């Protein structure tokens, strides 16, 4: 209230309001979901259009052959962070000839976000990200929040009314974890789970977006007729 | 991090006052009295060594400072601001004069430098003005003896005699009465000692009083012999003993 | 005061949201996409009758295959155009090929968020960027000071926009000819424009694969203005 | 004095048919009169149906190939997975090379 | 962080004024009055010292009049310390021009640059302006004798006669009344003093409260001479014009 | 260095420092430009609360940027010196690299960009100035007149005015200037300029300046008498 | 008023931030005392360990700055350590540049000058500390020089610092009224340390065990702190008096 | 007033309220402890299970610096990471120049001065963490705790976070009933108990345990994590002791 | 480049400058004007290193024109010469110095005198009655030492020049393709079209 002027100020209860406000942009964001088995990790995201004459804002970005993310909140901030991540995956290749561990991708994002929460004139990132990857220790899913907090999960969701999908996934846990070596089956559980967050509208062809990565599949993205298969 | 205070901390009020220079002078007002008197063959500067505790050794605290062999200074206001000004004043006498001309700067010019530093603290980003006024006393070959006052604004003025700080209004009045254009140096020392008694409360002796002169050359104070055109400093701090001698014939 | 990079409690950037306001005060700009090309039209809005209206440059070439219309603080656009042109020419120099319309747009939208305590405020102008490229055909883009761009089939920006947009939501279909769309733009402009639409106070332009981006002279538009009144009389 | 270049030998050859093309090179790598390796390949698949070879000073050749490969990666990231046409690849390589005009890549390049 | 304590010295009022300039001008209005009068055969500069103590060293002093080069001098009204900063700048600039072109600097070119420096402090960099107004009195072989004033805004203008500091309004009316174009240096000397005599807030004018300088053709054929009056000389010119 | 964003947006979408810079312009003495069939005239008010001026040496209100282009202005005088210098330098630079003097549009476009850059850079306030820029393109007879303002927007004008009481004189020019036929000679164009200032000025004394620009770098300022003639001549026509 | 938040003047010519920095000085509620022998300089300071989970040995406000200079801090530990490190650095550089050991008074001045800056420059805060520097200077003999947040410094015959500082000060004053001289006329530093503790006991009206204290001693060519057992010996010798 | 709106401003008390407010964020965090033992140190922390979707074992919070130092913190997790990254740079530079690995007291002051540095200016924010760290060097074992003001000392035992007092109590007990010393393997069990006991102040959500240790004899001088059978053994010891 | 000459007579300055431009064994051009107008009454001929000559001439030209517009006034020849000397004196200690020699012929309107300045790339300035840069001087200085008179008419100076160019065409080893001549006087700068 008197303490929400900038990121360099603490409230008297010990909070950072500019960070929590940044968190708010995420909640206004359209829902996206992530989940994984042991063999694949999936992103499903709901795309939002401006009006019926506009295209549907892309929500999924590829970072490397083995890793990528979905976004909810400020788009340009995701572009910046996904770009940073592309660089780090790439540096790791060129220098060490090594695919970047998803766990490390997490730490790097955390430390980049954090700096903008401790210094004057900056501003926190106004976006949340779900990172999936298949690295040297299997399938992975990550939740990034611009507080700096990064978390590894079997599944999760963020955006507007994500809480439905998140509880659905909490129930469905022991089923989807073991959808090993069946790609279309893991996607279905993604599509199903995202539906627990739909209200008054449902999934169409140019509205839904799915990405998958795993054991013998590069991070690739499906939209348009390529998702017809799943509605 | 770093000084992100790149803007002025002293600015014009709608009345056209510069607040921080005004307040710095208020800090000078509170300060202990000091004075300067210009005789025909000398200049005397004096002040009170108002000790902080009786446990402190106030010889270790010098309020009157040599700047060049023929220039000395004294102040009223904030001690620590004076100390750093003396440091910068000594160095600027070298860097921007001696290292160029192979001789020490004349009084008005060294004074002029000090004023510049003080002016800049009145306009630069991220600083307050200095909280002192200075009396600078000195001799140079072509200008003779002189005495100057520098204020926190960075302004300076030449004086026959004057005082600054606490009891200055009283002291300036006293000095007008006694000052003439025919004073021998010993007479001015004598007047300075009287004028200063007004404003000192407790003890008044050669341990509570700091007093230096700009007078004759002092070969005994040179450190070496055999360049007979080098005659030694004209600045001499009077000794504790020396001051008491002049207080018996007071 | 309060920092220029501050978030509101709803999680939006004050300075960006305030810039969105300035754009609403701007002159109207409309664009429509067709399988035969893209049309860009604008309200010139001369603030006095003495000012020479063709000196009002609010439609602007970026490359032979890309054009631009603006709305809001239009002095802010100059440097965005400069950037866009450099990006396009440069891309061609590095790759001996035309720069994609989407890519051009993204490159301009990167500029947008580089402000704070880099420039000192966001831009106060919206852009309609329209052109052709081999891979994705004719495209129209709305570039905002927030850093986000949207593809549209048709779109309006400026004062007359929410009115004009609802209008475009009705009239747009996937099989519009270039000539049909030229007319729509004139029509919707005359509706939302304060003063009465003629060939001096509005301007037309298109971009086709065959002839690239062309601004229409005052004579050519006047005949389209006439042609539109004859259509409107005849029902 | 330090000489920052060397010569690793080998030779390469490219021919273009109507609906195909070949890029060939020997697999020997040498310094002076010694063989370093009998099989160290120097013609690479670079993606988007481009193959490349940077013959001369291997270290410079490996640096260039590595960079061009990486140029392809970013072209995809920046222009919506568009295919890098051979003519564009060529031009991109002109810039990589000329960027080191006053400290060159000691290689003869073919794609 | 630091923004909290930033005065914003370089912003507009909603009336389109520069606050800090206006307030600086207000500071200047309380300073000893200074007067330039331009004649056909010379220029006078006269200024009133802010109120003296009898114990001030009067001859070894300058507070109001400063020599820029051999052909140009300035009268100061405002903060002296501020003024000296600007003076050394001006002095240096005159020397660069001589070194570059082997010709003494035209009076205006020097005035423009000093005025430009001032202007900068009002548009960028968040510092306070210099609380100083100058009268420039100088000669060059293009325009002959010239008078200029510059103020904290960085505006400069030319004059036949002008005052700055305290009581300018009073002084400008008196000057407007008695100044004529064909006028000579010694008439101007008289006007200058008789104007201060009337506008002063003191009991009467005495030598010890004045600085005085002339720039006449007063040397040996087509060459200019700059006279800064010694205290005795001011005493004499005061007797001689019957003001004491 | 000093960073602060001084030109920022308000909740209504206005940039207050730009708008306040405009207030400064409105306070400044009036200027007007009127373009003929074959010339352009720059007229300028001169605030009359000043006798004892030396007008030989006081900065004139119309400035030459090159020998074929002039710039007049309303607003802060000190601010305008900076824009003029910058413009003059760009003029010389453009000749050096293109081997051609600037077009009036180009020069105007440069100056406008400078003003704009000061509306979105840290540590600086915008220029308290609007300008009329006038001249003839090289090897071209068709006259050019442009106006710039602190925000950075610029455009072409048949004729235009800026400064205090400019709406009054814009009033007069809007009703007294026919596009279809502009002042066909120099005489006629200087006339329409003076009548527009005599709406707002005072006497035609040491109060009105006029500069006339013809093609091929043919520029000259008028002097009191020639203007005074114009003045007296309009007042006798006025007795109706 | 923002003249309260940064180091600019208030209307009565005062620097509140400097004044408030002095108040932080007592924030730890520790008292310290320094005196001079014929041969030595002794500094004592109370040692208070509240929490029982602490490692007693890691708790200290005396620092060894150089082979020959010791420093005791009255104020919060983070600022104290910051000042300690700076002074160590500054003493080493002095040795390297000028080829002799940095004297106590000089180091005091240099640290004083540094605090003076924070009173004038706005982005730097003052340190909430008072620094008492001690040595047996090769030119000046036994020396005590003290520094505060205002940038002030001076040499003392003896001194004290803390909340109960004035009691100790007058206690000492009285000794020197009586003794007539500038120092503790004593042979071994052991007895000068005993004198120190004794007079702190009268002045404070309290009794110390070996872990209620901290003791630094400066002699010609080293300054060393005493261990618990070294103080216990000193306490015991006091008791048997 | 307004003394509390800007970092590095002294109040008229003598306090920097921004630092005190940072402490509030620390107190709001999950619990962490450090126990010093005969030839080593043990670190444990409470990891709340926000949700059943958190992959167990896979959101590690204890961090190593160099090869012989362990750090754990309560409060803002990203602030902790920043501070460890600095610790890692500090240790690298020290080893590069002086060859020997960095002494634990030497290391604590590096963190101390850096954190203190973030109370000197209004352009930075103090650290939203209290950090427990320590290890084995050529002089023995060392435990430290460091607070947002840059204040730090050596500890026999230490804790911070929400369960700070419960743990503090439990640690006072141990220090009191073990004057001769506590063993490394013993201290590992004790730590597991104390984390379980002080989970009472945090108890809606159940949690995951996590321990690590440096023992001259049991880990050879280096920092390892505790897993498998030695972990489960101590989970059990704490299961017993709460029933 | 190569041949540049100047003679100052009673009422004017005359500048003669060779027309050839050679690279290697090809005369690339035979109608080069090795001069630039700095102001309406000041002219500068230049010779030296390829590229540097014209870059420098035009740089100086721009500065003088910028000054002319700023002060609405023309600098004296003395002033321009002092500015150009200073620029070269700067340049000689730069990372890559301008390798250009110049002559500045100007008519001072305040004095009503013609003035001729000779300045080498080092920044060595001298006012002369007649001057030359490069090998030309070796022939022409002694020639003018004999034939030149202070009070010569512009016509007399031009025949004096023919004497110089004839001797250079007799004895100089290279073909410099004649000269372009220009006169600076009270009425400005003009070029003789037949020499």
Curated annotation (Swiss-Prot), chain E:
GO cellular component, one term: nucleus
Domain of life: Eukaryota
InterPro entries, per database record: Ntn_hydrolases_N, Proteasome_alpha, Proteasome_alpha-type, Proteasome_asu_N, Proteasome_bsu_CS, Proteasome_sua/b
CDD domains in UniProt: proteasome_alpha_type_4
Record SMART domains: Proteasome_A_N (SM00948)
Main subcellular localisation: cytoplasm
Matching Gene3D superfamilies: Glutamine Phosphoribosylpyrophosphate, subunit 1, domain 1 (3.60.20.10)
Glycyl lysine isopeptide (Lys-Gly) (interchain with G-Cter in ubiquitin), cross-linked positions: 99, 198, 230
Subcellular location(s) of the protein: Cytoplasm; Nucleus
Matches recorded under PROSITE patterns: PROTEASOME_ALPHA_1, PROTEASOME_ALPHA_2
One Pfam short name: Proteasome
Keywords: Cytoplasm, Isopeptide bond, Nucleus, Proteasome, Ubl conjugation
GO terms, biological process: proteasomal ubiquitin-independent protein catabolic process; proteasome core complex assembly; proteasome-mediated ubiquitin-dependent protein catabolic process
Family statement drawn from the similarity comment of this UniProt entry: Belongs to the peptidase T1A family.
Note, other: Present with 17100 molecules/cell in log phase SD medium.
Function: The proteasome degrades poly-ubiquitinated proteins in the cytoplasm and in the nucleus. It is essential for the regulated turnover of proteins and for the removal of misfolded proteins. The proteasome is a multicatalytic proteinase complex that is characterized by its ability to cleave peptides with Arg, Phe, Tyr, Leu, and Glu adjacent to the leaving group at neutral or slightly basic pH. It has an ATP-dependent proteolytic activity.
Protein's UniProt name: Proteasome subunit alpha type-3
Protein's gene: PRE9
From Swiss-Prot, chain F:
The organism's place on the tree of life at top rank: Eukaryota
GO annotation (BP), single: proteasomal ubiquitin-independent protein catabolic process
CC annotations in GO: mitochondrion; nuclear outer membrane-endoplasmic reticulum membrane network; nucleus; proteasome complex; proteasome core complex, alpha-subunit complex; proteasome storage granule
Keyword Iron: no
Keyword Cytoplasm: yes
Residues spanning the membrane: none
CDD domains with a match to the protein in the record: proteasome_alpha_type_7
UniProt modified residues of type Phosphothreonine: 58
Localization in the cell: Cytoplasm; Nucleus
S-S bridge residues: none
Signal sequence annotation: none
Keywords from the UniProt entry: Cytoplasm, Nucleus, Phosphoprotein, Proteasome
Pfam families: Proteasome, Proteasome_A_N
Family: Belongs to the peptidase T1A family.
Subunit structure: The 26S proteasome consists of a 20S proteasome core and two 19S regulatory subunits. The 20S proteasome core is composed of 28 subunits that are arranged in four stacked rings, resulting in a barrel-shaped structure. The two end rings are each formed by seven alpha subunits, and the two central rings are each formed by seven beta subunits. The catalytic chamber with the active sites is on the inside of the barrel. Interacts with CIC1.
NCBIfam families the UniProt entry points to: PRK03996.1
Miscellaneous comment as given in the Swiss-Prot or TrEMBL entry: Present with 16800 molecules/cell in log phase SD medium.
Name of the protein described by the UniProt record: Proteasome subunit alpha type-4
Organism field: Saccharomyces cerevisiae (strain ATCC 204508 / S288c)
Swiss-Prot record, chain G:
Self-association state and partner proteins as the record states: The 26S proteasome consists of a 20S proteasome core and two 19S regulatory subunits. The 20S proteasome core is composed of 28 subunits that are arranged in four stacked rings, resulting in a barrel-shaped structure. The two end rings are each formed by seven alpha subunits, and the two central rings are each formed by seven beta subunits. The catalytic chamber with the active sites is on the inside of the barrel. Interacts with CIC1.
Protein name (record): Proteasome subunit alpha type-1
A Gene Ontology cellular-component term: proteasome core complex, alpha-subunit complex
InterPro entries: Ntn_hydrolases_N, Proteasome_alpha, Proteasome_alpha-type, Proteasome_asu_N, Proteasome_sua/b, Proteasome_subunit_alpha6
Family stated for the protein in its record: Belongs to the peptidase T1A family.
Gene3D superfamilies noted in UniProt: Glutamine Phosphoribosylpyrophosphate, subunit 1, domain 1 (3.60.20.10)
GO process annotations (BP): proteasomal ubiquitin-independent protein catabolic process; proteasome-mediated ubiquitin-dependent protein catabolic process
PROSITE patterns xref list: PROTEASOME_ALPHA_1, PROTEASOME_ALPHA_2
Organism: Saccharomyces cerevisiae (strain ATCC 204508 / S288c)
Keyword annotations from UniProtKB, A to Z: Acetylation, Cytoplasm, Isopeptide bond, Nucleus, Phosphoprotein, Proteasome, Ubl conjugation
Miscellaneous comment: Present with 15200 molecules/cell in log phase SD medium.
Modified residues (Phosphoserine): 227
Glycyl lysine isopeptide (Lys-Gly) (interchain with G-Cter in ubiquitin) cross-link site: 222
Keyword Ubl conjugation: yes
Highest taxon in the source lineage: Eukaryota
Phylogenetic classification of the source organism: Eukaryota, Fungi, Dikarya, Ascomycota, Saccharomycotina
Localization, UniProt: Cytoplasm; Nucleus
Swiss-Prot record, chain H:
GO BP annotation list: proteasomal ubiquitin-independent protein catabolic process; proteasome-mediated ubiquitin-dependent protein catabolic process
PTM info: The alpha and beta forms are probably products of the same gene with different post-translational modifications.
Source taxon at top rank: Eukaryota
Disulfide linkage: none
Keywords, sorted A to Z: Acetylation, Cytoplasm, Nucleus, Proteasome
Main subcellular localisation: cytoplasm
Localization per Swiss-Prot or TrEMBL: Cytoplasm; Nucleus
One annotated GO molecular function: mRNA binding
Keyword DNA repair: no
GO CC entries: nucleus; proteasome complex; proteasome core complex, alpha-subunit complex; proteasome storage granule
Family, as annotated: Belongs to the peptidase T1A family.
Subunit structure: The 26S proteasome consists of a 20S proteasome core and two 19S regulatory subunits. The 20S proteasome core is composed of 28 subunits that are arranged in four stacked rings, resulting in a barrel-shaped structure. The two end rings are each formed by seven alpha subunits, and the two central rings are each formed by seven beta subunits. The catalytic chamber with the active sites is on the inside of the barrel.
Miscellaneous comment: Present with 12000 molecules/cell in log phase SD medium.
Name this polypeptide is given: Probable proteasome subunit alpha type-7
Organism: Saccharomyces cerevisiae (strain ATCC 204508 / S288c) (Baker's yeast)
Chain's gene name: PRE10
Whole sequence portion shown: 6 to 248 of 288
């Amino acid at each position: 209230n008197n303490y929400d002027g900038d990121t360099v100020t603490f409230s008297p209860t010990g909070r950072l309001f500019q960070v929590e406000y940044a968190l708010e942009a995420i909640k206004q964001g359209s829902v996206t979901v992530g989940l994984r088995s042991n063999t694949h990790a999936v992103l499903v995201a709901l795309k939002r259009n401006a009006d019926e004459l506009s295209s549907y804002q892309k929500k999924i970005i590829k970072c490397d052959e083995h890793m990528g993310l979905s976004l909810a909140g400020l788009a340009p901030d995701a572009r910046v962070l996904s770009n940073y991540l592309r660089q780090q995956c790439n540096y790791s290749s060129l220098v060490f000839n090594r695919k970047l561990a998803v766990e490390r991708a997490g730490h790097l994002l955390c430390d980049k976000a954090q700096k903008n929460t401790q210094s004057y004139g900056g501003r926190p990132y106004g976006v949340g990200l779900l990172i999936i990857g298949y690295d040297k220790s299997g399938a992975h899913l990550l939740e990034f929040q611009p507080s700096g907090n990064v978390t590894e999960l079997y599944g999760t969701a963020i955006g507007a009314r994500s809480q439905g999908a998140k509880t659905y996934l909490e129930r469905t846990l022991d089923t989807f974890i073991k959808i090993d070596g069946n790609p279309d089956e893991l996607i279905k559980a993604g599509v199903e789970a995202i539906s627990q967050s739909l209200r008054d509208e449902s999934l169409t062809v140019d509205n839904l977006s799915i990405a998958i990565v795993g054991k013998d599949t590069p991070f690739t993205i499906y939209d348009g007729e390529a998702v017809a298969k799943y509605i | 991090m770093t000084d992100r205070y790149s803007f002025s901390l002293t600015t014009f009020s709608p009345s056209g006052k510069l607040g921080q220079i005004d307040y710095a002078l208020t800090a000078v007002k509170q300060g202990v009295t000091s004075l300067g008197i210009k005789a025909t063959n000398g200049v005397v500067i004096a002040t009170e060594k108002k000790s902080s505790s009786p446990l402190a050794m106030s010889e270790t605290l010098s309020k009157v400072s040599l700047l060049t062999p023929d220039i000395g200074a004294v102040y009223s206001g904030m001690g620590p601001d004076y100390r750093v000004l003396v440091d910068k004043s000594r160095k600027v006498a070298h860097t921007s004069y001696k290292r160029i001309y192979g001789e020490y700067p004349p009084t008005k010019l060294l004074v002029s430098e000090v004023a510049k530093i003080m002016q800049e603290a009145t306009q630069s980003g991220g600083v307050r003005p200095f909280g002192v006024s200075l009396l600078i006393a000195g001799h140079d070959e072509f200008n003779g003896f002189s005495l100057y006052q520098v204020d926190p604004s960075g302004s300076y003025f030449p004086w026959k005699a004057t005082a600054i700080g606490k009891g200055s209004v009283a002291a300036k009045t006293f000095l007008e009465k006694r000052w003439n254009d025919e004073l021998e140096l010993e007479d001015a020392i004598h007047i300075a000692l009287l004028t200063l008694k007004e404003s000192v409360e407790g003890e008044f002796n050669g341990d509570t009083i700091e007093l230096a002169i700009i007078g004759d050359e002092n070969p005994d104070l040179l450190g070496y012999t055999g360049i007979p055109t080098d005659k030694g400093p004209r600045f001499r701090k009077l000794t504790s003993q020396e001051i008491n001698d002049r207080l018996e014939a007071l | 005061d309060r920092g220029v990079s501050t978030f509101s409690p709803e999680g939006r950037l004050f300075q960006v949201e305030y810039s969105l306001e300035a754009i609403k005060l701007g002159s109207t700009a409309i664009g429509i996409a067709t399988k035969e090309g893209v049309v860009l039209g604008v309200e010139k809005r001369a603030t006095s009758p003495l000012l020479e209206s063709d000196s009002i440059e609010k439609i602007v070439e970026i490359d032979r295959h890309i054009g631009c219309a603006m709305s809001g603080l239009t002095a802010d656009a100059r440097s965005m155009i400069e950037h866009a042109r450099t990006a396009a020419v440069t891309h061609n120099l590095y790759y001996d090929e035309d720069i994609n319309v989407e890519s051009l747009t993204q490159s301009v939208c990167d500029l947008a968020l580089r402000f704070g305590e880099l420039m000192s405020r966001p831009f106060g102008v919206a852009l309609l960027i329209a052109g052709h490229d081999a891979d994705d055909g004719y495209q129209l883009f709305h570039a905002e000071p927030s850093g986000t761009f949207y593809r549209y089939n048709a779109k309006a920006i400026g004062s007359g926009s929410e009115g004009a947009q609802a209008e475009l939501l009705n009239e747009w279909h996937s099989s519009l000819t270039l000539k049909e769309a030229e007319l729509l733009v004139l029509k919707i402009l005359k509706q939302v424009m304060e003063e009465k639409l003629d060939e001096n106070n509005a301007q037309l332009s298109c971009i086709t694969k065959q002839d690239g981006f062309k601004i229409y002279d005052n004579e050519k538009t006047a005949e389209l203005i006439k042609e539109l009144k004859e259509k409107e009389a005849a029902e | 004095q330090f000489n920052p270049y060397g010569d690793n030998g080998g030779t390469i050859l490219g021919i273009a048919g109507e609906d195909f093309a070949v890029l060939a090179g020997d697999t020997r790598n040498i310094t002076d009169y010694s063989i370093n390796s009998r099989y160290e390949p120097k013609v690479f698949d670079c993606g988007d149906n481009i193959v490349m070879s940077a013959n001369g000073f291997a270290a410079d050749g490996d640096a260039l190939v590595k960079r061009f490969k990486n140029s392809v990666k970013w072209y995809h990231f920046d222009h919506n997975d568009k295919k890098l046409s051979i003519n564009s690849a060529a031009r991109n390589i002109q810039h990589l090379l000329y960027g080191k005009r006053f400290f060159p890549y000691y290689v003869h390049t073919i794609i | 962080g630091s923004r909290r304590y930033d005065s914003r010295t370089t912003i507009f009022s909603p009336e389109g004024r520069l606050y800090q300039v206006e307030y600086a001008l207000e500071s200047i209005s309380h300073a000893g009055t200074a007067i330039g009068i331009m004649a056909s055969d010379g220029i006078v500069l006269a200024a009133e010292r802010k109120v003296t103590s009898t114990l001030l060293e009067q001859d070894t002093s300058t507070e109001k009049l400063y020599k820029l080069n051999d052909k140009i001098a300035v009268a100061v009204a405002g903060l002296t310390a501020d003024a000296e900063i600007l003076i050394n700048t001006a002095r240096i600039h005159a020397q660069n021009y001589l070194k570059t072109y082997n010709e003494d600097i035209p009076v205006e070119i020097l005035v423009r640059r000093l005025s430009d420096i001032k202007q900068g402090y009002t548009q960028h960099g968040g510092l306070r302006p210099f609380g100083v107004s100058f009268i420039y009195a100088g000669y060059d072989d293009r325009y002959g004798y010239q008078l200029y004033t510059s103020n904290p805004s960085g505006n400069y203008t030319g004059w036949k006669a002008i005052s700055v500091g305290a009581n300018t309004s009073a002084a400008q009316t008196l000057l407007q009344m008695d100044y004529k174009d064909d006028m000579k240096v010694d008439d101007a000397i008289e006007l200058a003093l008789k104007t201060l005599s009337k506008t002063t807030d003191s009991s009467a004018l005495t030598y010890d409260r004045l600085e005085f300088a002339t720039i006449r053709k007063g040397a040996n054929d087509g060459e200019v001479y700059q006279k800064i009056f010694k205290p005795q000389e001011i005493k004499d010119i005061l007797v001689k014009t019957g003001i004491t | 260095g000093y960073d602060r964003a001084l030109s920022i947006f308000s909740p209504d979408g206005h940039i207050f420092q730009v708008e306040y810079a405009l207030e400064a312009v409105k306070r400044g003495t009036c200027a007007v430009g009127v373009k003929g069939k074959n010339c352009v005239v720059l007229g300028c008010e001169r605030r009359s609360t000043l006798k004892l001026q030396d007008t030989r040496i006081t900065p004139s209100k119309v400035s030459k940027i090159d020998s074929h282009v002039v710039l007049s202005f309303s607003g802060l005088n000190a601010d305008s010196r900076i824009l003029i210098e910058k413009a003059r330098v760009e003029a010389q630079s453009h000749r050096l690299t293109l081997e051609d003097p600037v077009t009036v549009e180009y020069l105007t476009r440069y100056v406008a960009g400078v003003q704009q850059r000061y509306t979105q850079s840290g540590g600086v306030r915008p220029f308290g100035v609007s300008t009329l820029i006038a001249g003839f393109d090289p090897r071209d007879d068709e006259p050019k007149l442009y106006q710039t303002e602190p925000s950075g927007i610029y455009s072409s004008w048949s004729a235009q005015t800026i400064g205090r009481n400019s709406k009054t004189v814009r009033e007069f020019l809007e009703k007294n200037y026919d596009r279809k036929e502009p002042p066909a000679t120099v005489e006629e164009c200087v006339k329409l300029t003076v009548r527009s200032l005599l709406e707002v000025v005072q006497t035609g004394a040491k109060n009105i300046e006029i500069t006339v620009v013809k093609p091929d770098s043919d520029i000259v300022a008028l002097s009191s008498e020639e203007i005074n003639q114009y003045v007296t001549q309009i007042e006798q026509e006025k007795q109706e | 008023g923002y003249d309260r938040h940064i180091t600019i003047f208030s209307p009565e010519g005062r620097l509140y931030q400097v004044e408030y920095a002095f108040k932080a000085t007592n924030q730890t509620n520790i008292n310290s005392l320094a005196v001079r022998g014929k041969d030595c300089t002794v500094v004592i300071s109370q040692k208070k360990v509240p929490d029982k989970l602490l490692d007693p040995t890691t708790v200290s406000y005396i620092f060894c700055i150089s082979r020959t200079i010791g420093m005791v801090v009255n104020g919060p530990i983070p600022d104290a350590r910051n000042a300690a490190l700076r002074a160590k650095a500054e003493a080493a550089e002095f040795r390297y540049k000028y080829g002799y050991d940095m004297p106590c008074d000089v180091l005091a001045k240099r640290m004083a000058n540094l605090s003076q800056i924070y009173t004038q420059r706005a982005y730097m805060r003052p340190l909430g500390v008072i620094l008492t520097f001690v040595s047996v200077d090769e030119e000046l003999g036994p020396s005590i020089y003290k520094t505060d947040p205002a940038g002030y410094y001076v040499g003392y015959k003896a001194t004290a610092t803390g909340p109960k500082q004035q009691e100790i000060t007058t206690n000492l004053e009285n000794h020197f009224k009586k003794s007539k001289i500038d120092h503790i006329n004593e042979e071994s530093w052991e007895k000068v340390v005993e004198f120190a503790i004794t007079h702190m006991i009268d002045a404070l009206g309290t009794e110390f065990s070996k872990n209620d204290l901290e003791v630094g001693v400066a002699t010609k060519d080293k300054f060393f702190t005493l261990s618990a057992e070294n103080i216990e010996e000193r306490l015991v010798a006091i008791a048997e008096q | 007033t307004g003394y509390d709106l800007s970092n590095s401003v002294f109040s008229p008390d003598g306090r920097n309220f921004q630092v005190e407010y940072a402490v509030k964020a620390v107190e709001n965090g999950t619990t962490s402890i450090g126990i010093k033992c005969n030839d080593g140190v043990v670190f444990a922390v409470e990891k709340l299970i926000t949700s059943k979707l958190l992959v167990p074992q896979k959101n590690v919070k204890i961090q190593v610096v160099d090869r012989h130092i362990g750090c754990v913190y309560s409060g803002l997790i990203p602030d902790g990471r920043h501070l460890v990254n600095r610790g890692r740079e500090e240790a690298a530079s020290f080893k590069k120049l002086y060859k020997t690995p960095i002494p634990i007291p030497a290391f604590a002051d590096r963190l101390g001065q850096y954190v203190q540095a973030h109370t000197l200016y209004n352009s930075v924010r103090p650290f939203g963490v209290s950090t427990i760290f320590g290890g084995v060097d050529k002089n023995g074992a060392h435990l430290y705790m460091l607070e947002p003001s840059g204040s730090y000392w050596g500890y026999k035992g230490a804790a911070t976070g929400k369960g700070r007092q419960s743990a503090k109590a439990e640690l006072e007990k141990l220090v009191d009933h073990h004057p001769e010393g506590l063993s490394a393997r013993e201290a590992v069990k004790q730590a597991a108990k104390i984390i379980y006991l002080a989970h009472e102040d945090n108890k809606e959500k159940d949690f995951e345990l996590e321990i690590s240790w440096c023992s001259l004899s049991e880990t050879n001088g280096l920092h390892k994590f505790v897993k498998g059978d030695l972990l489960q053994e101590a989970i059990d010891f704490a299961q017993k002791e709460i029933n | 480049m190569d041949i540049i000459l100047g003679i100052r007579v009673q009422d004017s300055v005359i500048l003669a400058s060779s027309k050839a431009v050679t690279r290697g064994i090809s005369v690339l051009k035979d109608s080069d004007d090795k001069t630039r107008q700095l102001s309406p009454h000041t002219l500068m001929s230049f010779a030296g290193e390829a590229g540097d000559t014209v870059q420098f001439a035009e740089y100086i030209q721009a500065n003088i024109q910028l000054y002319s517009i700023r002060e609405d006034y023309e600098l004296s020849p003395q002033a321009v010469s002092s500015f150009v000397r200073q620029e070269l004196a700067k340049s000689i200690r730069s990372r890559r110095p301008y390798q250009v020699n110049v002559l500045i012929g100007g008519y001072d309107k305040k004095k009503n005198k013609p003035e001729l300045y000779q300045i080498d790339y080092l920044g060595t300035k001298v006012e002369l009655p007649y001057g030359a840069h490069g090998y030309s001087g070796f022939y022409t200085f002694s020639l003018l030492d004999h034939h030149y008179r202070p009070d010569m008419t512009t016509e007399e100076g031009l025949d004096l020049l023919k004497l110089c160019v004839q001797e250079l065409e007799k004895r100089m080893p290279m073909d410099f393709k004649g000269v372009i001549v220009k006169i600076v006087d009270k009425d400005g700068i003009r070029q003789v079209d037949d020499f």
